[PDB]
Ligand binder design. Structure first.
Ligand SMILES: Nc1ncnc2c1ncn2[C@@H]1O[C@H](COP(=O)(O)OP(=O)(O)O)[C@@H](O)[C@H]1O
Ligand SMILES: Nc1ncnc2c1ncn2[C@@H]1O[C@H](COP(=O)(O)OP(=O)(O)O)[C@@H](O)[C@H]1O
Ligand SMILES: Nc1ncnc2c1ncn2[C@@H]1O[C@H](COP(=O)(O)OP(=O)(O)O)[C@@H](O)[C@H]1O
Ligand SMILES: [Mg+2]
Ligand SMILES: [Mg+2]
Ligand SMILES: [Mg+2]
Lengths: 371, 371, 371
């Protein structure tokens, strides 16, 4: 049989079949419900919308994310999204395909316990497995050694791995990702008179961020350049025809990744977090870690972020060390690619958690059989 | 057939074929096991590593020496190391080659009894012999008269030999060698803020000791010079790019050989030990012993140690006696060279302990046929 | 004149006058600076806060420890804390009172050199002395023989003393103490969905650890009991009214003292460390050392830790030896009590380092006149 790989991210859902190069279904992980009363009978009206249908009708819906900071908060909507993924997007029967799921490190245990329970009861999957997202990214990188910086919509985390061995004590996790940057961009757009308060407007600001934001090599010099002339100004057309122009907000929004104090957080930036994760490892592997910095996720797709990370790590690392940032063009799907590679391995087939084992042991078996 | 010579030291393993000038396989006598859990499947993961493979992966392994103070303490790891030496390093079948083994004097009898049993049962060697390390050094020196000071990683011992006759009552043994100096250097490096606590860091400190330590002709004058200026300061680059600077610790570490009280030991120094060994011999051979002081082993490779030993022995010996310290440049392999010379001798071929004799007599035959 | 005793620990500062039974000033060794911008003028706003004032306003401050692992890392904040201790807490003039300072063994020399320089220049103290913390604990125990296990917030160390004589070669030091346990508890609280990332939240987790953690006599049996029922579960009320419940984390956090591998460290536990320290001493004093195990410091205040240590040492020691763990109820201030006792001794008054001697010799005199 063919195995299923499902990367349930905070923002997007990636699904497909093991052995493929790219996921087949990529749709937003949103559930939308009407906030206005219907007046016209005879047309199909649903109580909820999932995914692209929710995005298309977002003008009359309230959009709610069931996953927040890599933690599932609404299990009803999560089950709806899983049903949608299994039936309307993949056109498969979950009872005939083992499914591989992903999760961020340092997550609550009940999250994966309930994921296993839902998989084994609601959908009757013959076997399932929960992997750590950064490990899959390293699988997709074709490497057994390196520190992975995976930053998506909810969670930014660091996992150092050397010769296939992970160092759990050096694992870093920070709840600062694309959604926080979108909210900060919404906050800072009010300085030019642009107001976005609803969820659909949040989806518009997210699109603006995806299409106009970039990371500046030097923040203060970029600010001076923006305050000096209008070369950095760009225009964006709203869906109603309105045109907005933004200046320094293009690079101020992703600067929060390196200066978390912009949103009131006391934590250090991603570069200092990676440096601290490297320094917590054994001294004999830091040289290999310095040259194998792997970035994955949507939040790593900002233009010029790899150069900024390389500059900061070089400024933090000793001069004799060689710093190399690895940013493949397809890093937005590295987790799914690595999951498919893992599920397509012959040696992995003995690591599946089957229905009989779950019945014998209960939901607690996921802690034993999964890292 | 060709005979095998194996010098199983506390720190290093020297192996080769009788008749050669240098051993062919020289690798550390360490067994390393992972102390972290693997996360990446599909790659070759072994439960243990032996030798250079353990040194290369020491960042994720715990390193254990199976031989401590010239005494085998872990026979499982010792058998693993012997298997590695026989198969992966020499590429020979032990059933077709007589092997010559080495041992420090005044060792427990069970050590060589179990060595003989392992050789005759696990590897089915046709014949084996156990020699005293210091005698072999005298063989490699091309001498039949002299007192040998052999100091390796575990044991420092003195064996006076005159005209091919040894004096067992004058044999000295002291459990103070390179490993103790490495531990003392680790202890004293904390005075400059440098912390090394793990086994891999111990291997780093051992390398630092090998590359930066030297013996001072006058300890107090050297201390005053070090406290006066920075001429004695030198820098070392850690594997992660960090740079450390050490001053008086360069000559304080090997000073423990002459002042054992630095590590809390009540025994006398190597010079006084050699003088006492000489004085316990007959008065008519002391003149020949004074001029034939032979040094062998890695711990005798410190710069300026021969001059210090000569000065101390001259200060202890009568003025009319002539003191000459013999420190060949290749004394790190003198034991192996002498073992090969002994195994290449025609008259020695009748001294082998064969399988039939061991079967008739048992492990106790090594006490009768070996000194 | 009256002598001052100041135990500058990693976590807390203990100060008072020689001859007293308890220190008069006990406040946290923290310096806090605002991380938000002020908006209301006319009120007293300070650039930094020290001690209890920093604890009270920790919601708008970033808290930094100037002492890390018994080593002073921020001398500006350390000088601020010393000024606070001298003036706002003790209400004394440092120029009129000799001060006694404490330090952990195997510390960098520059630490105490700079401590002496600051005492003799910034505060113009007429005389000062630096003692080893564990020796003072033995003074407070009313003993001249015994091995002291002192574990505070930064350093856990062992010092064996027999008949007033210390054995430096058997002194153990391990950088695993209450702060590491607090960080591990912060890491493991994420399994139940509780997130603490800021310094103030670290102070909250430290309080939770102090009020709810205990050492289990049998770790595996305790884990089975916790996984079987809810008898071990307890509740804690957060300062904002939130209530959290923890189960096995109560005894998993202090288990790191006996299993350092939980935080990725390769070192052995405190029981094995004490056993190795005892075994490195002379065979004729081990019997007296076995019956005089003295514990001091905040990290020794966990319920049931003395019984666990006694069980482990009995399992390691020979059956005919008698193991007695000495855990006085006031061991959180044993270092300060012993310092006051030492400073109140007539024979000690000739061991003070005076201003004239420091001027003649410089900062290097502390190495000669202090152990
Ligand atoms: N080109 C881009 N530039 C900046 N941010 C992007 C880009 N593409 C996607 N993102 C952001 O990355 C996040 C989604 O990436 P993804 O790795 O799919 O997250 P998740 O795994 O949580 O679904 C969103 O916050 C999105 O706004
Ligand atoms: N150049 C050197 N200077 C100082 N010590 C050395 C040097 N080379 C080797 N050593 C020490 O000698 C010991 C190993 O020497 P060796 O004679 O091979 O010992 P063994 O026979 O016990 O293996 C190690 O402790 C090593 O640190
Ligand atoms: N009742 C308790 N249980 C567990 N840990 C405690 C308790 N009381 C204090 N501690 C811990 O001990 C440390 C402080 O003790 P102390 O001996 O004063 O350390 P220091 O000398 O480094 O200031 C802190 O980590 C604190 O959390
Ligand atoms: Mg993701
Ligand atoms: Mg040797
Ligand atoms: Mg203390």
């Amino acid at each position: 049989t063919t195995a299923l790989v499902c990367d349930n991210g905070s923002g997007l859902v990636k699904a497909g079949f093991a052995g493929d190069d790219a996921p087949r279904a990529v749709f937003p992980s949103i559930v939308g419900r009407p906030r206005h009363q219907g007046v016209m009978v005879g047309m199909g009206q649903k109580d909820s919308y999932v995914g692209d249908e929710a995005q298309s009708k977002r003008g009359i819906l309230t959009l709610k994310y069931p996953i927040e900071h890599g933690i599932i908060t609404n299990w009803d909507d999560m089950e709806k999204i899983w049903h949608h993924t299994f039936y309307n997007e993949l056109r498969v029967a979950p009872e005939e395909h083992p499914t591989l799921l992903t999760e961020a490190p340092l997550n609550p245990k009940a999250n994966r316990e309930k994921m296993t329970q839902i998989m084994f009861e609601t959908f009757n999957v013959p076997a399932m497995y929960v992997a750590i997202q950064a490990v899959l990214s390293l699988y997709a990188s074709g490497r057994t050694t390196g520190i992975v910086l995976d930053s998506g919509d909810g969670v930014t985390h660091n996992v150092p791995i050397y010769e296939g061995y992970a160092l759990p004590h050096a694992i870093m996790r920070l709840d600062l990702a694309g959604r926080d940057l979108t909210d900060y961009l919404m906050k800072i757009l009010t300085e030019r008179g642009y107001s976005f308060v609803t969820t659909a407007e949040r989806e518009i600001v997210r699109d603006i961020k995806e299409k106009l934001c970039y990371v500046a090599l030097d923040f203060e010099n970029e600010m001076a350049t923006a305050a000096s002339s209008s070369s950095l100004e760009k225009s964006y057309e709203l869906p109603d025809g309105q045109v907005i122009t933004i200046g320094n907000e293009r690079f101020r929004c992703p600067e929060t990744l390196f200066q978390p104090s912009f949103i009131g957080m006391e934590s250090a930036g991603i570069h200092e977090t990676t440096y601290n994760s490297i320094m917590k490892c054994d001294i004999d592997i830091r040289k290999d870690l310095y040259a194998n910095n792997v970035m994955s996720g949507g939040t790593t797709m900002y233009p010029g972020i790899a150069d900024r990370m390389q500059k900061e790590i070089t400024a933090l690392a000793p001069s004799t060390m060689k710093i190399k940032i690895i940013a493949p063009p397809e890093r937005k799907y590295s987790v799914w690619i690595g999951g498919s590679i893992l599920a397509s391995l012959s040696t992995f087939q003995q690591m599946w958690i089957t229905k009989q084992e779950y019945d014998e042991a209960g939901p607690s078996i996921v802690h034993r059989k999964c890292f």
